């Protein structure tokens with residue numbers, strides 16, 4: 001559509017913010033709060049509805065992992081509950097294929113999920129599909145050529161450089177070439193024929209490095225690093241440019257929004273979020289009201 005939507009996130013506690021950024025004019029709008037605060041969620045769009053998926057409410061009244069799927073209609077500026085997932089999934093990744101949402105990995109307490117389930121908007125129903133070969137939380141997910149990729153994350157013991165691909169018509173996961181960098185809570189998206197993995201956490205440092213996987217060559221190649229180190233960033237694509245939003249640099253919960261131009265191989269500062277935050281869900285759709 002036209003706007004980059006950021007939903008939820010974390011600063012001191014989980015957040016309920018929904019705000020939309022307009023690349024055309026640099027403006028931010030605050031829209032209807034989520035019904036429940038959540039960090040570690042993912043955002044996606046299907047048929048002009050924005051979806052907030054999974055996460056956890058980290059609050060002083062207690063911490064609760066979320067199995068929620070909530071539906072935002074930009075036409076009405078209202079959130080409605082949609083069907084809940086089979087399980088809570090904090091630090092989730094999601095991908096859309098053929099109008100269906102795949103919820104991938106994430107955690108529930110000390111449970112690190114390998115499980116994957118698929119939502120059908122037409123039926124408001126989730127169904128489990130084949131689990132990943134690896135347990136992954138903080139998992140990056142992208143879709144390219146109607147195949148679903150799960151990239152990096154944390155399996156309960158180790159942060160991962162591994163990645164795998166789901167073939168829907170085979171209901172089967174297979175490993176792909178591992179990344180050159182261990183990344184948990186990277187931003188993962190697709191641009192042209194490539195899966196990008198930006199930033200993340202390796203268990204010691206937050207990362208500025210960025211690498212991309214070419215499905216034709218099966219190789220990962222580093223591109224220019226981001227201006228900021230960041231883990232638990234939000235990421236999206238708007239008109240052939242990658243945007244990264246917020247995250248944590250080991251010192252600050254960033255308000256920084258950076259954009260990548262693949263033609264010049266450069267990252268630039270674009271705007272600041274209205275306040276610093278990590279673990280947001282991000283997606284692109286039409287302007288509201």
Ligand SMILES: CN(Cc1cc([C@H](CC(=O)O)c2ccc3c(c2)nnn3C)ccc1Cl)S(C)(=O)=O
Nearest residue numbers: 010039040091138154184185201231232278279
């Ligand atoms: C920080 N957020 C939660 C979160 C954590 C991690 C990972 C998990 C892991 O590798 O164990 C993580 C853990 C600790 C980190 C880290 C990343 N970066 N710095 N530090 C100290 C990945 C994604 C998300 Cl969304 S949130 C609460 O904002 O949603």
Ligand SMILES: [Cl-]
Nearest residue numbers: 040056058090
């Ligand atoms: Cl968390």
